[PDB]
Ligand binder design. Structure first.
Ligand SMILES: *C(=O)CCCCCCCCCCC
Ligand SMILES: *C(=O)CCCCCCCCCCC
Lengths: 411, 411
């Protein structure tokens, strides 16, 4: 009966380009939302995003090599090395076969897609780069990594939009537990801060528009919210079976103990006023982890700062916790970071992990005037210290009404 | 100990728009490769593809609704209903919760992506449709279906390029086996026959160029092959736990018994001359299915008709079977259909399933002069009758050196 644990973290976010820095900034209640300058946003209703500041990979990827890879791919490779080094794991011939990857993304190479398409409009097919396909496709983060580290184990890539980070990790854990693998680098990476990304989500009227105050735009559960805030980043984890980890004295951040999935079966982009699906997903994980809602100390909300989004989730929480509704801590890091799409559930799994380590809980900044019936403790404004928190649960929900929840446990 | 079985099939291919018709054509050695007329291919090195002929969904999707969905999405919904009807399964409140989906695609809405991007180049962001995001994203086939059939169980979507069909199905099976679900509609859908698809794979020089004879272009293992042939389609399956199926007297096509994954850890688009990774993947499935290579009657090659591709796979086969190398039947349906990218491993799982039903094995057409050291029986030219075939194995391999194999078993 294989127990899956976390032995390495790696991350690039709108508030730090390392695990420890992003964590520091998050507790400090720092925002990473800035105005876009890599493209002309004049015609854009939204002109800011949670961006990755001063990203450098020269030490990890030759410029010769970068040309074959969209930023989302670069981001994820960098965050994977971070995780691989941190794990300490050493790949051997008697090894590779048993180490794999489960990394995804919501869209992938949107930028190079725009680039190549543009090229094709101006110059014709001859202009499309020969690396177009392998530079934009979603599974290339895992493709490059497995190659870089000579990994021969199971490699998959889940693309479930906003839920991708949660799924990739959950299924990484599954794969190991099944016996198909002993280690798995898992998570998600996105960099959709483009014309098509900004323009697209803005076409659906899903994005916030507070351009006069980018850092205040993302306000989960607050009364004046007006749609999520797009963020770039990548969050990777090294999951591994308990024994295999011990036998090598790996530093163990925590143990993955539960994984729940569900479908809303309602709208293609809208959550039921109910939160019915989100509930089922949390519910399924509690049962998988074989524990009770009363046991969760901190929930990492999907809480993207869309009017319906946030109401629905809160509903679900009540439903799931009921009594413990108020005793439980719910917070949205998206308040500082924005929503990282495919990377979202991965970075937030890392938050949930660190929150157990440090017995501290990142705040929901910008929460000035919460909604009405709210009975919940959204850790508004400032970080929170905790005593005996043994479990944290992390939620993510995406389009197609696809939800997933992960439960982390101390030591 | 949950046994997963197949209780419903659904498909749209370049040789039929139903399971039974595509199967008939395949045994008959019919090609589905035609010249492209939906876009101007003058500047294109390749001017043909395996296309879906006279596709109609009016009875399944309102035109009001089609506008919100890329063809790949339409294709997959249609193929899913096919599967759902065929299953006979009836969704109930005491049900939904236990029925989910695992459907993917390599790229998804490439067409609407091109459309919206074009729009944006000409008109600015205001031109991007409000359904851009949910119309192109990869997980929307499963999103729409779960919605249409009120499914609340686990829904995921694997995007592992050319391997997607195999993975989605394998992980569907896993999910059920785990207990997370009782039924799962799984498979893949693609429709990359576009400027960016044709142009892109042609930029990598990966595509065949025999425009004077489209139907002969795809020639797996033959001496004059020059790169795969792009095909559109969608292949869906209804996987379900054995007991749950019986208790409802569901018609059972076969039982999924093995699932193997692997990584090449070599090149990002190229297979080792070795076939080392493909071997490991087949190998892993035999062990998962708990059987021997000697037991496989028919292998459904990835066999895309690329020079290296086909050599590498054949190598792997030898490696895995060795003795049984020659006694085993290996064939590439891609010889008639072309390669269906994300849909590929799904349709071919259906082939592998029907081949057990009918004890018949689709041919590798166009195989005029095979390569040299070939000791293998590629069922060249015409279909083959078989006696006591209890297992068929189906391979698929994609970019990022991601491989996966599935083992099907009779009754
Ligand atoms: C979360 O579900 C929001 C939508 C996720 C879609 C993938 C990321 C957006 C790509 C944007 C245009 C292709
Ligand atoms: C198989 O691995 C071939 C590549 C799969 C990529 C997904 C389908 C191609 C989309 C083409 C341009 C985006």
């Amino acid at each position: 009966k294989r127990r899956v644990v976390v032995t390495g973290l790696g991350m690039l976010s709108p508030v730090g380009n390392t695990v420890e820095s992003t964590w520091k900034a998050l507790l400090a209640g720092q925002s990473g939302i800035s105005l876009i300058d890599h493209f002309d946003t004049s015609a854009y209703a939204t002109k800011f995003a949670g961006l990755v500041k001063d990203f450098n990979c020269e030490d990890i990827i030759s410029r010769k090599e970068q040309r074959k890879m969209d930023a989302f791919i670069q981001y994820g490779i960098v965050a994977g090395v971070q995780a691989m080094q941190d794990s300490g794991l050493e790949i051997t011939e008697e090894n590779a076969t048993r180490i794999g990857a489960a990394i995804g993304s919501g869209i992938g190479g949107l930028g190079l897609i725009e680039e190549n398409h543009t090229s094709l409009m101006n110059g014709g097919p001859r202009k499309i780069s020969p690396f177009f396909v392998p530079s934009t496709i979603v599974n290339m983060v895992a493709g490059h990594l497995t190659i870089m580290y000579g990994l021969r184990g199971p490699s998959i890539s889940i693309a479930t939009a906003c839920t991708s980070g949660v799924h990739n990790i959950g299924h990484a854990a599954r794969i190991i537990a099944y016996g198909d693998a002993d280690v798995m680098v898992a998570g998600g990476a996105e960099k959709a801060s483009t014309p098509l990304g900004v323009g697209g989500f803005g076409a659906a009227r899903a994005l916030s528009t507070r351009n006069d105050n980018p850092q205040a735009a993302s306000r989960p559960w607050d009364k004046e919210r007006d749609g999520f805030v797009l963020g770039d980043g990548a969050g990777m984890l090294v999951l591994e079976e308990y024994e295999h980890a011990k036998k090598r004295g790996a530093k163990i951040y925590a143990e993955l103990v539960g994984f729940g999935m569900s479908s809303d079966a309602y709208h293609m982009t809208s959550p039921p006023e109910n939160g019915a699906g989100a509930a089922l997903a949390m519910a399924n994980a509690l049962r998988d982890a074989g524990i009770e809602a009363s046991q969760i100390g901190y929930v990492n909300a999907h809480g993207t700062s869309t009017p319906a989004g946030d109401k629905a989730e809160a509903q679900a929480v009540k439903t799931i916790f009921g009594e413990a509704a108020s005793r439980v801590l719910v917070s949205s890091t998206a308040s500082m970071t924005g929503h990282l799409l495919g990377a979202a559930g991965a970075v937030e799994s890392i938050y949930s992990i660190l929150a157990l380590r440090d017995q501290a809980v990142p705040p929901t900044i910008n929460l000035d005037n919460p909604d009405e019936g709210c009975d919940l403790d959204f850790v508004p404004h400032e970080a929170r210290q905790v005593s005996g928190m043994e479990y944290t649960l992390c939620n993510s929900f995406g389009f197609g009404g696809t939800n997933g929840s992960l439960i982390f446990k101390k030591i």
